[PDB]
Design an enzyme around this catalytic site. Structure first.
Site, PDB file in Angstrom:
ATOM      1  N   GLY C  39     -14.374  79.544  16.536  1.00  0.00           N
ATOM      2  CA  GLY C  39     -14.362  78.100  16.649  1.00  0.00           C
ATOM      3  C   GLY C  39     -13.421  77.600  15.560  1.00  0.00           C
ATOM      4  N   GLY C  40     -13.009  78.215  14.690  1.00  0.00           N
ATOM      5  CA  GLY C  40     -12.248  77.694  13.395  1.00  0.00           C
ATOM      6  C   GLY C  40     -10.820  77.159  13.945  1.00  0.00           C
ATOM      7  CG  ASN C  48      -9.520  84.372  16.195  1.00  0.00           C
ATOM      8  OD1 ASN C  48      -8.373  83.988  15.957  1.00  0.00           O
ATOM      9  ND2 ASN C  48     -10.326  84.064  15.764  1.00  0.00           N
ATOM     10  CG  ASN C 107     -16.432  86.109  15.294  1.00  0.00           C
ATOM     11  OD1 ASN C 107     -16.788  85.223  14.761  1.00  0.00           O
ATOM     12  ND2 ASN C 107     -15.985  87.212  14.450  1.00  0.00           N
ATOM     13  CG  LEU C 109     -17.477  77.608  19.607  1.00  0.00           C
ATOM     14  CD1 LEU C 109     -18.887  76.772  19.236  1.00  0.00           C
ATOM     15  CD2 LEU C 109     -16.190  76.837  19.386  1.00  0.00           C
ATOM     16  NE  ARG C 186      -6.399  80.440  12.728  1.00  0.00           N
ATOM     17  CZ  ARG C 186      -7.413  80.985  12.718  1.00  0.00           C
ATOM     18  NH1 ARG C 186      -7.586  82.352  12.687  1.00  0.00           N
ATOM     19  NH2 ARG C 186      -8.701  80.295  12.570  1.00  0.00           N
ATOM     20  CG  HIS C 263     -17.315  84.071  10.509  1.00  0.00           C
ATOM     21  ND1 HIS C 263     -18.580  84.165  10.622  1.00  0.00           N
ATOM     22  CD2 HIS C 263     -16.634  83.137  10.884  1.00  0.00           C
ATOM     23  CE1 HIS C 263     -18.723  83.307  11.688  1.00  0.00           C
ATOM     24  NE2 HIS C 263     -17.543  82.680  12.051  1.00  0.00           N
ATOM     25  CD1 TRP C 264     -11.586  87.453  12.871  1.00  0.00           C
ATOM     26  CD2 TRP C 264      -9.861  87.390  11.047  1.00  0.00           C
ATOM     27  NE1 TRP C 264     -10.303  87.478  13.203  1.00  0.00           N
ATOM     28  CE2 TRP C 264      -9.284  87.397  12.302  1.00  0.00           C
ATOM     29  CE3 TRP C 264      -8.977  87.362  10.031  1.00  0.00           C
ATOM     30  CZ2 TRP C 264      -7.960  87.198  12.618  1.00  0.00           C
ATOM     31  CZ3 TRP C 264      -7.686  87.289  10.225  1.00  0.00           C
ATOM     32  CH2 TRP C 264      -7.022  87.025  11.471  1.00  0.00           C
TER      33      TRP C 264
END
Lengths: 284, 284, 284, 284
Positions: C39-40, C48, C107, C109, C186, C263-264
């Site tokens: 959700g970033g 992603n 991942n 969200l 991004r 996180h990725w």
């Protein structure tokens, strides 16, 4: 592959001649891996890994070592801190067999032996796979001794079939794995005076001059190799809270937790365990 | 009871003369207690404990010591592992004041110093009160460096009021405590060239020969005294997961966590912290 | 396989027509899997999962859905609790595409969306793979909001290149993954008024009448399927302490933690991630 | 202040008449507090709190209530979820004594009852002191049932003195507290046919329609009052890992852990527990 076809012996020097029993398979393969069983009454290489050895022998040269005090290896009544002693035995066996750097797979007491060996002979230890290991584990939430450790202790002091079967039942999630046959064989092995003397000597080696050798959660930040921690979510002997310091402080650590799984990870999640191990150790 | 009326200097020996500044109150009371502030930019005994000193000095003989690198204490460009170094300074002060066995209160860095002293000079340290201590804390879940520690590092590299105020904001739960006056008082001490030399000297000390002296989570199992660990539930510098190894392995540990509280527990929870500390240390 | 060859659109009804963009590959394969990104700012299916889609398309029919508010899916300014909204969108897309029961990979969200969907339409959700998921995660140790969530928020309120690059840097362990190209793309996607309106509406959907829909750690004991939790040890957005309630309360849960990983997860441990996913989801 | 001088009965309505026995002291004091004992075989207000009642009654008006199923309170063969049922009983007693908003002290089962009351009758419950509470605890690491809970179950199936003494042993850190007199006093109440009917009725209540009423870790985020969680570090019934969700999600939580302390905190740490409780509840 049978207890007899794979059976081997080697004599090594640890403060004197010491006979180690081990099982050998996959002699054609190029990657050697060493399997180290856990420390519960009647534990041995074949009984604890019998089925895993067949599968892993398709990809690797498997050495499954009966740790001193266990199986058909020697059962001295006197030794130092058990993991240090067992790690010296294994180092004797590595030299004799001409091994270089070998990955190690260890459950519980065998996990601690694998880590002690990896800290003391850093060049000789490859990737480690550790199933609910002792020593590097520190139960941050669980009061010590745990229920599973108490049932192990109670057997050592009151070696009845009923105490052995109580221990075997807290070792697994699915209690139907504890057949009257498996209790019959474990009790016969576990309740011999030599096996009872070995267990007491192992259990009381942790409170001695070199007691810090057992507190490997203080040291595992020194490991440089990849390490796979594997835990049964329902492990009652070495519960999951024991994983946290090793996961945090080993730079190249991974952790795999299996729900619906106890301390006997390599049997209770046989297929998922063997696939993780083959993949982490490369693939042979 | 003011900065000026309580101010004291002692010259102690740590590989040569070392001036320590401290604050002394409750000279009327027979039970001494030493307070050790945290390692944030511009931290000192009076800015960090001024109001605690007044309350505690009703019951105790209070020594609040500016640690080396901080306040009006010597700011050497080079030293060993900070806690070892600061504990040797404190040992020097103890011999000069003729203190025997004295309890110690310490926040973050000064908590690590308290523990390093209690390990290195076991007969000289009494009960320990430790608020979000550094060194004996190890963050089993929080990636290092934490958000709080990155803000401490950022100020060291770019020593602006803005970077100081960003650090103070993550030190507390109620951001309204970060007044323009507190910011001005911390930034005055923080931004001197001696202070900025002391911060780099400190960073270098954690990577050096005796770096293990800093990893006191590996050693607190040796503490024989009662230890009160106090944590803010919302501590963003040394988060709550850092308490677990110390709580497990200190025989006579207790833990008190305050909700709605960050890293500056002695101020954020002034009355409750003062009451806990007075009771735990035996009321005078 | 390219952004264009795989690109598809479908219109579904959620309180009106809603356009969903998604990527499709492996149409020959028999097992469908749905990928749900995080959700970033600037997050989308291709950016992603771009590389994972090629690999997974060898074994499965891959549907990688841009969640409402993201990528080329519609960006309404008003909706209910985001995961409930996104789960209704996906249910619309399942019906339109004639899917039965499909495993989901999510991942952050997207993990929360996958769980909300699995709780609300239990027959339609197969095995779940969740990488540092939102909603089912509850940070038992980490103060909320975390550093990574604050950097996400700060961008939404101050959409500068510098804020976006600060978020991208706490999303990964290896900061060399954050190339000036990846920041350029991004930022361009993230700072459009429609993407900024969507992010604010997502972020403020959690404090509304149906806020309990986001607190999925209260509900996951109702899941009956196997669930693979995957965490980067160094995740600063949704840290590992958020895994514990889901691991405990989902009967058929597993957890895999990767050291040296943020996180990725699907990018930073590309090969190990794809192998876990292919094996857990059967093998196609 | 004896069992006899403090003894009281009230008849309250819970789907019909229900006699509760309780103990009352400090009728001289204006601030009331209710004490709720744990759910161990033969537990009651006086055996579990007798000495706490004397100390607390210096400061407070103390009501220590035998929960339904326990002591001299009615032991119905059937009821709903135990905590819901016990909270409705307590609500009945509150209306009869004309209590407004009253703080509650509760150990294990009586801690769950305190919380169920505070959720179900929010205006009637004040500050909560909860010692190893059941229901709001969820053991993120400990496999369920814990060693302590298995001993509670075993006594229910084979109600022998030996099984009662095995339960009492895992309830405490210092096993010398388990005197032959305490064992005789617990076993006298525990082994009545009404008591043994109340235990099975209780087990059935946790599996029934309103079983979620028992899972208060999903609901404590709703508590608006200050809550003191108190844990023995060595609690083998409701271990320390069970505190984490409640400490995270209760806004005005605090946690105090005692080392060298099991599940019977009010006795094992009598003086410290009495001082914490008196201070937290406002001193009278």
């Amino acid at each position: 592959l049978t207890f007899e076809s794979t059976s081997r012996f080697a004599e090594v020097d640890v403060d004197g001649p010491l006979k180690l029993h081990y099982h050998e398979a996959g002699v054609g393969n190029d990657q050697t891996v060493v399997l180290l069983h856990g420390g519960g009454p009647g534990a041995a290489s074949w009984t604890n890994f019998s089925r895993n050895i067949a599968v892993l022998a398709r990809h690797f040269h498997v050495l499954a070592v009966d740790q001193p005090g266990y199986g058909h290896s020697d059962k001295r009544a006197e030794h130092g801190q058990f993991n240090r002693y067992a790690a010296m035995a294994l180092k004797g066996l590595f030299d004799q067999l001409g091994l270089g750097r070998v990955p190690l797979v260890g459950n519980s007491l065998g996990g601690g032996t694998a880590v002690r060996f990896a800290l003391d002979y850093p060049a000789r230890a490859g990737r480690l796979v550790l199933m609910g290991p002792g020593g590097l584990s520190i139960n941050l939430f669980a009061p010590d001794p745990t229920e599973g450790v108490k049932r192990l202790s109670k057997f050592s002091v009151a070696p009845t079939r009923e105490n052995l079967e109580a221990f075997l039942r807290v070792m697994v999630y699915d209690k139907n794995l504890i057949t009257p046959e498996l209790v019959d064989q474990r009790f016969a092995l576990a309740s011999t005076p030599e096996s009872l003397t070995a267990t007491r000597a192992m259990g009381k080696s942790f409170a001695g001059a070199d007691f810090e050798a057992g507190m490997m959660w203080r040291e595992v930040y020194r490991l440089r190799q990849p390490v796979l921690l594997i835990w049964g979510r329902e492990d009652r002997v070495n519960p999951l809270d024991g994983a946290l310091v090793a996961l945090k402080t080993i730079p190249r650590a991974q952790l795999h937790v299996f729900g619906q799984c106890g301390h006997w990870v390599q049997v209770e999640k046989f297929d998922e365990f063997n696939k993780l191990t083959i993949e982490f150790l490369g693939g042979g």
